[PDB]
Structure formats: C-alpha cells, structure tokens
Paper text:
The NS1 protein of influenza virus is an important virulence factor and has been demonstrated to interact with a wide variety of viral and cellular biomolecules. The effector domain (ED) of the influenza virus virulence factor NS1 is capable of interaction with a variety of cellular and viral targets, although regulation of these events is poorly understood. Furthermore, both domains form homodimers in vitro. While the conformation of the RBD dimer appears to be conserved, two forms of the ED dimer have been proposed: the strand–strand dimer and the helix–helix dimer.
A new condition for crystallization of this protein [0.1 M Bis-Tris pH 6.0, 0.2 M NaCl, 22%(w/v) PEG 3350, 20 mM xylitol] was discovered using the hanging-drop vapour-diffusion method. Diffraction data extending to 1.8 Å resolution were collected from a crystal grown in the presence of 40 mM thieno[2,3-­b]pyridin-2-ylmethanol. The novel crystal form of PR8 NS1 ED (W187A) shows the α/β fold common to all structures of NS1 ED. The introduction of a W187A mutation into the ED induces a monomeric phenotype and, intriguingly, two crystal structures of the PR8 NS1 ED containing this mutation also exhibit this strand–strand interface. However, it is intriguing to observe that the strand–strand dimer is conserved among all three PR8 NS1 ED (W187A) structures that have now been solved. Therefore, since the PR8 NS1 ED W187A mutant is monomeric in vitro, it appears highly likely that the helix–helix dimer is the predominant interface for ED homodimerization. The partial con­servation of the strand–strand packing interface indicates that while it may not allow ED dimerization, extension of the β-sheet is a possible method of interaction with cellular and viral binding partners.
Residue numbers in the entry: 86 to 203
Write the structure that this text describes.
C-alpha cells in the first residue's frame, strides 16, 4: 500500500491561506506559490510525501511556515496531477527557497526534505 510521511499536522495541511502579495510560478508539473510580502523571517519547509517500499516517492504537498506557524509558501502538483520526478521536486524547492531568500528570509528544510535532497 501507498502510505504518507509528513512534517505537517492535519490542521497545517488542511488550512486555507492567503498571500498578502501573491506570487505563483509553474515549474513543469509543479506549482509554486509564495507571499512576496514576507521578509526577515525564519522559515521552515515542511512536506507530505507518498511512501512505497519504505522510500519517498511523490510530493503530495509542501508548505513553508514561519516559526510562529504562518504559511508563506507552497508547492503542489498541478491539478491535472501530471506526476513528477524527484528532480522536478528538487527544482521547485530551489525556486521557492531562492524567492524567499531574495526577500531576506532564512529558510531551512525538514528532516524529511533533507533526506529527499540526495
């Protein structure tokens, strides 16, 4: 069976959020959203991945959170749910990290993503 390993709580994954200054970029099979208003924060990237054979397979959802718990960024598969490679995920994360860091934020990633990184 396909299972799911996530850094996020049920509430964190379900929450609706608005960006103060919306930015949305599509990069291949993945959508990247980030709030252009956010600056000088410590941000943590948290992800939910499907798992098969005890290995991380596809990204279901990634959200970027301030330490206080506010969502400031998101990566999700396109609605067509095209399906993607690990390289697609790594590219989309780099794009999000780049944008956030350009706005003077400090970005770190979860243990789940660290592991995925290689």
């Amino acid at each position: 069976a396909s299972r799911y390993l996530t850094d996020m709580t049920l509430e964190e994954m379900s929450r609706d959020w608005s960006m103060l200054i919306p930015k949305q970029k599509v990069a291949g099979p993945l959508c990247i959203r980030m709030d252009q208003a956010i600056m000088d924060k410590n941000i943590i990237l948290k992800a939910n991945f499907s798992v098969i054979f005890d290995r991380l397979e596809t990204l279901i959802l990634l959200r970027a959170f301030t330490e206080e718990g506010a969502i400031v960024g998101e990566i999700s598969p396109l609605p067509s749910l095209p399906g993607h490679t690990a390289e697609d995920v790594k590219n989309a994360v780099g794009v999000l990290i780049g944008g956030l860091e350009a706005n003077d934020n400090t970005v770190r990633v979860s243990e789940t993503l660290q592991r995925f990184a290689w």
